[PDB]
């Protein structure tokens, strides 16, 4: 609809497409099976955000109902977008930067914004896998290292911050991270973490070495395994003590939370991360298929499994939170029992849980001034089920504490950390496909130097930039970039893909070309959401961002062991030079989409 | 006496570099 000239003789033509696949068998890779393509697309949508990000948002935002919100927004943003992304790579036969430079070559910023976004997400997601395989190496020993406090020098008492905090909370901040008190104070490289980082990048270079003919078998294993383990964790989780008391708590509807501008944003920004939209990897994976492959049936099957898995991991996660909260309620209520037995001389099995409150008043009516020194607790469930931990603590200080109280402790910890590893790995494959393929269409290296050499300089180049998160303050740097980065770029890049296919390429040329592949020109549901609904629905997510950014009082959490009233929380209000980092990681992937479009329109004219 | 997390690192870091070697090998080979 927008008048761009010369669209033909820049893209392949429709009558020429039946001859192009009997010559792109050379000089272009190809899938072996159809299941090799669906398993590497499920692994790119499902990873590490269904574990510690979705089940918190499913409950904290009026769970049981948030399902509703998350659903609608899905079959509205997600479906339409994913479909249009699968059908644009199969037709134009290029990667991510080659598709948007084929249609109006003055655009070209959507390819450079997808490469900068895939570089920054895959930079810090390879440090989370670095932390995960550190907890995997510290398995294979029956007293796990996060099970008991160490002794200090004289072997008479514990270490001081292991006694005020928890031993698990001590293994993360002092024996894994060696964290500092601020983001300003940084130290050395912390060798162990560095070795682990090396291992992670090395394991990543072995799987994605020769492009797509290695990540095939890789995807197979790294895509099934995760599922089987997740299952095994369901029939163990639903048996322990306190599951079905953490499943009910997840699915309690609170309809007041639906009328909130902050609910529909993170429900909207999870859909763009429950899938892998606006990343540039799903277009490069779809471009290897046959020309008559059904891409309408693939986008429904991929989105049904992604909507079913996000509920399925939340059942497994909140079964373990329900077991940990029932255990902490019983090891609290047995100490309120133990106080009066040690003060009023009663038999052992005397004064259980059924008779606590009536035996409170039998003692104070027997003899006063002996109840006044008694310290009791006000501990109760829905206060042990209601901690707001999120993002890394749901696996390193919450899930791994409930594993130590199970029967076979060093076996449920090996099975738990190899699964997370697998998830991370599949997501990594995705992001790597995202940064290598646009770096070949730019031709930064000569057409010598085969596929082993370009991937080796990406895995070694992103390794040296990953030294930031190995410092003492390296966990404050990783909690900074994540959110911001992701969110902003994702939304913005996602809007201009829906715009430049419908109004620059033309939705009438699109329909014809699609029909040429499958038959049966798409329904009234596809024509409505492509044209009016999903571009409008992606603007109110972009409008709600600058509503919740201007009033949330941007802060961050520190540890600070030498601090009065220590183990509660802390928020100490980021320094003024950190806005340089926020502008850099969130702004310049957003600004290369207009920035190249202004440069190309003034170089010619 | 062995710092048990080192030796599990060792048998993992052993497999990856010999997994890489053979890789590049066959690569350049059929190349
Ligand atoms: C259901 O969701 C509402 C929405 O936030 C929760 O509400 C608030 O309660 C706090 C009390 O700490 C007030 O300061 C807020 O003003 C309330 N919000 C509104 C919009 O009224 C409520 O807690 C949730 N229900 C339950 C049982 O937790
Ligand atoms: C604790 O250890 C220190 C040396 O680290 C020693 O001087 C002190 O006497 C010890 N305390 C006790 C109670 O043994
Ligand atoms: C980090 O650990 C080293 C010993 O491994 C210690 O000397 C140093 O004080 C720790 N860093 C901080 C900030 O405490
Ligand atoms: C607790 O002590 C009272 C006092 O004699 C007794 O009647 C009751 O049976 C005891 N409870 C149990 C479980 O033994
Ligand atoms: C015993 O102590 C409780 C706790 O404050 C109090 O509520 C109760 O009234 C006391 N009993 C008497 C007889 O005052």
UniProtKB/Swiss-Prot annotation, chain A:
Pfam families: SNF (PF00209). The gene is SLC6A19. Its main location: membrane. It is linked to Hartnup disorder: Autosomal recessive abnormality of renal and gastrointestinal neutral amino acid transport noted for its clinical variability. First described in 1956, HND is characterized by increases in the urinary and intestinal excretion of neutral amino acids. Individuals with typical Hartnup aminoaciduria may be asymptomatic, some develop a photosensitive pellagra-like rash, attacks of cerebellar ataxia and other neurological or psychiatric features. Hyperglycinuria: A condition characterized by excess of glycine in the urine. In some cases it is associated with renal colic and renal oxalate stones. The keyword Lipid metabolism does not apply. Disulfide bonds: none annotated. This is Sodium-dependent neutral amino acid transporter B(0)AT1. It is a multi-pass membrane protein. The lineage of its organism: Eukaryota, Metazoa, Chordata, Craniata, Vertebrata. GO terms for biological process: amino acid transport; neutral amino acid transport; response to nutrient; sodium ion transmembrane transport; viral life cycle. It catalyses: L-alanine(in) + Na(+)(in) = L-alanine(out) + Na(+)(out); L-cysteine(in) + Na(+)(in) = L-cysteine(out) + Na(+)(out); L-glutamine(in) + Na(+)(in) = L-glutamine(out) + Na(+)(out); glycine(in) + Na(+)(in) = glycine(out) + Na(+)(out). It comes from Homo sapiens. Changing residue 62 to R: In HND; abolishes amino acid transport activity. It comes from the Eukaryota. Residues 59-63, 138-188, 239-264, 322-409, 474-486, 549-577 are extracellular. Residues 1-37, 85-116, 210-217, 286-300, 431-452, 508-527 are cytoplasmic. Changing residue 236 to Q: In HND; does not affect amino acid transport activity when expressed alone; decreases amino acid transport activity in presence of ACE2 or CLTRN; decreased surface cell expression when expressed with CLTRN or ACE2. Keywords: Amino-acid transport, Cell membrane, Disease variant, Glycoprotein, Membrane, Phosphoprotein, Symport, Transmembrane, Transmembrane helix, Transport. The chain crosses the membrane at residues 38-58, 64-84, 117-137, 189-209, 218-238, 265-285, 301-321, 410-430, 453-473, 487-507, 528-548, 578-598. PROSITE patterns: NA_NEUROTRAN_SYMP_1, NA_NEUROTRAN_SYMP_3. GO terms for cellular component: apical plasma membrane; brush border membrane; extracellular exosome; plasma membrane.
Curated annotation (Swiss-Prot), chain B:
Expressed in endothelial cells from small and large arteries, and in arterial smooth muscle cells (at protein level). Expressed in enterocytes of the small intestine, Leydig cells and Sertoli cells (at protein level). Expressed in the renal proximal tubule and the small intestine (at protein level). Expressed in heart, kidney, testis, and gastrointestinal system (at protein level). In lung, expressed at low levels in some alveolar type 2 cells, the expression seems to be individual-specific (at protein level). Expressed in nasal epithelial cells (at protein level). Induction: Up-regulated in failing heart. Expression is induced by IFNA and IFNG. Exposure to cigarette smoke increases expression in lungs. Expression is decreased in nasal and bronchial epithelium of individuals with allergy after allergen challenge. IL13 stimulation decreases expression in nasal and bronchial epithelium. It is found in: Cell membrane; Cytoplasm; Cell projection, Cilium; Apical cell membrane. An engeneered stable, dimeric and secreted receptor with combined mutations that increase the affinity for human coronavirus SARS-CoV-2 spike protein shows potent SARS-CoV and SARS-CoV-2 neutralization in vitro. The chain crosses the membrane at residues 4-24. Proteolytic cleavage by ADAM17 generates a secreted form. Also cleaved by serine proteases: TMPRSS2, TMPRSS11D and HPN/TMPRSS1. The extracellular region of the ACE2 enzyme is composed of two domains. The first is a zinc metallopeptidase domain (residues 19-611). The second domain is located at the C-terminus (residues 612-740) and is 48% identical to human collectrin. Essential counter-regulatory carboxypeptidase of the renin-angiotensin hormone system that is a critical regulator of blood volume, systemic vascular resistance, and thus cardiovascular homeostasis. Converts angiotensin I to angiotensin 1-9, a nine-amino acid peptide with anti-hypertrophic effects in cardiomyocytes, and angiotensin II to angiotensin 1-7, which then acts as a beneficial vasodilator and anti-proliferation agent, counterbalancing the actions of the vasoconstrictor angiotensin II. Homodimer. Interacts with the catalytically active form of TMPRSS2. Interacts with SLC6A19; this interaction is essential for expression and function of SLC6A19 in intestine. Interacts with ITGA5:ITGB1. Interacts (via PDZ-binding motif) with NHERF1 (via PDZ domains); the interaction may enhance ACE2 membrane residence. (Microbial infection) Interacts with SARS coronavirus/SARS-CoV spike protein. Belongs to the peptidase M2 family. It comes from Homo sapiens. The gene is ACE2.
